[PDB]
């Protein structure tokens, strides 16, 4: 009877999953966040269903063990709040912190795995709170920005020497990802020294200046200052690239090109990443479960 209490009290995808109503949960995710590829969510469905269940020994032990349920709240709440226990934002923050740790250690694939996991956990959250709901959305957008920047940098690294313009463009677009300032420092350092190496002194000076307004002391700040001094003395760019730091644009999460306000674009309804128009109906690169440009009613995590 517990499962039907759950479903009567909330149709959140998390609650449907906990109840075993996998099909109804998949349909709800389809309408709400455009979910279309299911495999990357399997573990998470599994995690929820088994996380709110526990097994006590029977008498005798040969008899199958008996199933009990872990609820969301203790018994002091009304009957319409009888809800499954679903792990919350504190685990999500742990996954994000592991992402940041792998980012600092220059393990970008593993960082991406961590940010993707936090996104999948947020897709199946249950909060009871306007502040937790807003916090969940902000973390989701942050994880997307970290995945986007890391994917730009992995593309840059994958490049054959001789794709110098594409490489310098990617180095620049990496600085556009909305990481924390201390993390944006990594991208600015890449962009600065790659543009300096390739005789793009105007670019190098911009990236060095942006670096120095976050980190002002230490040996990287001094490297940045001497790079900026030399670059300001040269005041030239050997290789023009499509990049205006003062314009308003986003980066296409599939082709890694700037999308200006007049550029026709579509977006992923789940992660909010943006794409050039030829990516409509394809699967989002950030989390790889939802359909770019699909009609969607919006993420539901608030009971």
């Amino acid at each position: 009877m517990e499962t039907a209490i759950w479903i009567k009290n909330s149709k959140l995808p998390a609650v449907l999953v906990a109840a075993g109503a996998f099909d109804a949960a998949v349909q709800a995710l389809s309408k709400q966040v455009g979910v279309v590829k299911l495999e990357p969510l399997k573990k998470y469905f599994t995690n929820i269903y088994e996380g709110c269940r526990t097994y006590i020994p029977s008498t005798p032990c040969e008899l199958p063990a008996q199933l009990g349920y872990v609820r969301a709240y203790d018994d002091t709440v009304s009957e319409d709040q009888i809800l499954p226990y679903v792990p919350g934002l504190d685990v999500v923050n742990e996954k994000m912190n592991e992402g940041y740790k792998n980012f600092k250690l220059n393990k970008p694939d593993i960082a991406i795995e961590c940010f993707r996991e936090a996104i999948y956990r947020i897709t199946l959250l249950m909060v009871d709170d306007a502040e937790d709901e807003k916090l969940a959305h902000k973390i989701l957008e942050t994880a997307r920005e970290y995945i986007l920047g890391l994917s730009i940098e992995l593309e840059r690294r994958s490049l054959k020497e001789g794709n110098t313009v594409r490489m310098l463009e990617l180095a620049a677009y990496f600085t556009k990802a909305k990481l924390s300032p201390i993390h944006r420092t990594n991208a600015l350092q890449v962009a600065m020294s790659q543009h300096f190496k390739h005789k793009n002194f105007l670019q190098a000076s911009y990236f060095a200046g942006e670096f120095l307004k976050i980190i002002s002391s230490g040996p990287r700040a001094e490297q940045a200052r001497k790079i900026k001094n030399k670059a300001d003395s040269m005041a030239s760019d050997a290789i023009p690239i499509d990049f205006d730091p003062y314009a308003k644009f986003d980066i296409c999460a599939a082709t890694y090109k700037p999308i200006y306000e007049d550029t026709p674009s579509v977006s992923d309804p789940l992660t909010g990443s943006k794409y050039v128009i030829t990516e409509k109906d394809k699967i989002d690169r950030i989390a790889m479960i939802s359909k770019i440009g699909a009609p969607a009613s919006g993420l539901r995590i608030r009971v």
């Binding site: 009877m1 517990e2 075993g20 996998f22 099909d23 998949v26 299911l38 495999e39 399997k42 469905f45 599994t46 995690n47 269903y49 088994e50 996380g51 269940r53 526990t54 097994y55 006590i56 020994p57 029977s58 008498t59 005798p60 032990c61 040969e62 008899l63 199958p64 063990a65 008996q66 199933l67 009990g68 349920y69 872990v70 609820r71 203790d74 018994d75 009888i82 226990y85 792990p87 685990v91 742990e94 996954k95």
Partner: protein
């Protein structure tokens, strides 16, 4: 009364060695309760041996231990078919039926023998009825059976059996999880510290989201007094121990691959693994259906 109090008290808490001792105090004496509990206690110790091949109950018990290996019920059923069977006999037949997955038939076998509450073994069979109904997710029937039986009334030694049944109901219904039910399980873990009472307390902490206390009891069971000194019934309770660890890890966000693999190797028929394979297939089928 009280003849059986210590036998039953040690059996239901999982103190099977001390249970056998309490039974041995009746050296060279036998009745159907002594037979029933000595057979079940020897079985739980991994040391079963045929106590009374002569009598009806003993034949049934040996058929039952055999069934546990063969998983074939035909002999047991054909022996009890159309006969006037006692509650102890029905206990064993209905446990077998329930192990086969036939929970409806099992509950009916139980209900057969619950008429008279002054008949030997009836309280035992009532507990089994409760357990078998809860296994089939028929919680309202379990409550009704228990309420009607108990209001319709209690010997000193059956008291613990009825409390055990009630506690299974309260576990399945999250009823006073943090007050009376938890106190019951914790008191038993303190007075009769065994694998059984310890896992009961652990389940009650998990239901309360008390990660720290759950982990404390997991560490305690992993220590030497339980995992080495009690290597005997540690084996009996290991699969449920593994399932519990899995739910605690999942509550923390930790990986459960190793634990799930241990459990599936050790007891691929554990309730956790049935649920696990079922949701695995359910999800893979959805994946296929929407492609």
């Amino acid at each position: 009364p009280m003849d059986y109090f210590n036998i039953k008290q040690n059996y239901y808490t999982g103190n099977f060695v001390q249970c056998l001792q309490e039974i041995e105090k009746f050296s060279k004496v036998t009745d159907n309760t002594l037979l029933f509990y000595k057979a079940k206690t020897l079985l739980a110790l991994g040391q079963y041996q045929s106590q009374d091949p002569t009598s009806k109950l003993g034949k049934v018990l040996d058929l039952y231990v055999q069934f546990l290996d063969t998983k074939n019920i035909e002999e047991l059923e054909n022996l009890l078919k159309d006969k006037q069977n006692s509650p102890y006999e029905l206990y064993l037949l209905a446990t077998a039926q329930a192990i086969l997955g036939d929970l409806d038939k099992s509950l009916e076998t139980c209900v057969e023998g619950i008429d008279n509450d002054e008949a030997e073994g009836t309280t035992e069979l009532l507990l089994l009825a409760i357990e078998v109904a809860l296994l089939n997710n028929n919680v309202s029937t379990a409550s009704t059976i228990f309420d009607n039986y108990t209001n319709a009334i209690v010997s000193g030694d059956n008291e613990m059996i009825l409390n055990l049944a009630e506690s299974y109901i309260k576990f399945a219904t999250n009823k006073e999880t943090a007050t009376s039910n938890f106190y019951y399980y914790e008191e038993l873990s303190q007075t009769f510290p065994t694998w059984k009472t310890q896992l009961g307390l652990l389940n009650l902490h998990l239901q309360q989201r008390n990660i720290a206390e759950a982990q404390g009891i997991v560490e305690l069971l992993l220590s030497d007094y339980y995992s080495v000194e009690q290597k005997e019934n540690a084996v009996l309770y290991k699969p449920t121990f593994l399932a519990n660890q899995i739910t605690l890890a999942l509550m923390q966000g930790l990986d459960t691959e190793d634990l799930t693999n241990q459990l599936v190797k050790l007891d691929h028929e554990h309730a956790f693994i049935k649920h696990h394979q079922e949701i695995d297939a359910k999800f893979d089928e959805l994946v296929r259906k929407y492609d």
